[PDB]
A paper describes a structure:
The linear ubiquitin (Ub) chain assembly complex (LUBAC) generates Met1-linked “linear” Ub chains that regulate the activation of the nuclear factor κB (NFκB) transcription factor and other processes. (2006) identified the linear Ub chain assembly complex (LUBAC), which consists of the chain-assembling E3 ligase HOIP as well as HOIL-1 and SHARPIN (Walczak et al., 2012). HOIP also comprises several NPL4 zinc finger (NZF) Ub binding domains (UBDs) that target it to ubiquitinated proteins (Haas et al., 2009), a Ub-associated (UBA) domain that mediates interactions with HOIL-1 (Yagi et al., 2012), and N-terminal PUB (peptide:N-glycanase/UBA- or UBX-containing proteins) and B box domains of unknown functions. Here, we show that OTULIN interacts directly with the N-terminal PUB domain of HOIP via a conserved PUB-interacting motif (PIM) in OTULIN.
Our structure contains 13 molecules within the asymmetric unit that superimpose with a low root-mean-square deviation (rmsd; 0.9–1.2 Å). As anticipated, residues 59–158 of HOIP form a PUB domain resembling that of PNGase, the only other PUB domain structurally characterized to date (Allen et al., 2006; Zhao et al., 2007). HOIP and PNGase superimpose with an rmsd of 7.2 Å for residues 59–158 of HOIP, and most secondary structure elements are conserved. In addition, the HOIP PUB domain contains two N-terminal helices and one C-terminal helix that contribute to the hydrophobic core of the PUB domain, revealing why shorter constructs were insoluble. Hydrophobic residues within the N-terminal extension are conserved among most HOIP orthologs, suggesting that the extended fold is conserved. In contrast, the residues forming a putative PIM pocket are highly conserved in HOIP. The HOIP PIM pocket is formed by hydrophobic residues located on helices α4 (equivalent to helix α2 in PNGase, hereafter named αA) and α5 (equivalent to helix α3 in PNGase, hereafter named αB) and on the β1 strand (compare Figures 2B and 1E). In our apo structures, the side chain of Tyr94 is rotated to bind the HOIP Tyr pocket in cis, appearing to block access to the PIM pocket.
Numbering used by the authors: 2 to 183
Write the structure that this text describes.
């Protein structure tokens, strides 16, 4: 991980976050994400907003095929919350998220630290049955939301590829989990 290796990564990371701001419903290809996937950087360096190591530590229980799927699905839902905040057609009820929502209960509530990601978006204040933005806040911090969404999108992409045995840096992640995803 040289200085020119850390430079290429920061740059693509800032650009991809900008891509989300322009089109929130936009889908990202594997080739589009690879500069952030195939980098030889420390885990704590790739995920600055997201605590990837803690997500693994608190959720890696049982078979890899199980908790990686539980994790990907949860991250997928969390990603959508972010995409919605950046969307031109944003729900009028965007200021809050309810934990007893059918999708949330079956996805995000299954993973430890799902609520922690929501606060990164801006859902910092405690509302009944969930989290919400402060009352005085007019709009989401689009740059903050774009940054978090990208990392959430990133981590899900890595976990998905692990299951597929197609990750460009597969060995490093299997050493993190200390188990092979068959």
């Amino acid at each position: 991980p040289g200085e020119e290796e850390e430079r290429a990564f920061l740059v693509a990371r800032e650009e991809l976050a900008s891509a989300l701001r322009r089109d929130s419903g936009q889908a990202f290809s594997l080739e589009q994400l690879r500069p952030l996937l195939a980098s030889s950087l420390p885990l704590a360096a790739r995920y600055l907003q997201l605590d990837a190591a803690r997500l693994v530590r608190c959720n890696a229980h049982g078979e890899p095929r199980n908790y990686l799927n539980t994790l990907s699905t949860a991250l997928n839902i969390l990603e959508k919350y972010g995409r919605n905040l950046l969307s031109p057609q944003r729900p009028r009820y965007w200021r809050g998220v309810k934990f007893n929502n059918p999708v949330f209960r079956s996805t995000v509530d299954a993973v430890q630290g799902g609520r922690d990601v929501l606060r990164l978006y801006g859902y910092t204040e405690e509302q009944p049955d969930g989290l919400s933005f402060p009352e005085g806040q007019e709009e989401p911090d689009e740059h903050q939301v774009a940054t978090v969404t990208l990392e959430v999108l990133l981590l899900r992409t890595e976990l998905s590829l692990l299951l597929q045995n197609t990750h460009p840096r597969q060995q490093a992640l299997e050493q993190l989990l200390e188990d092979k995803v068959e």
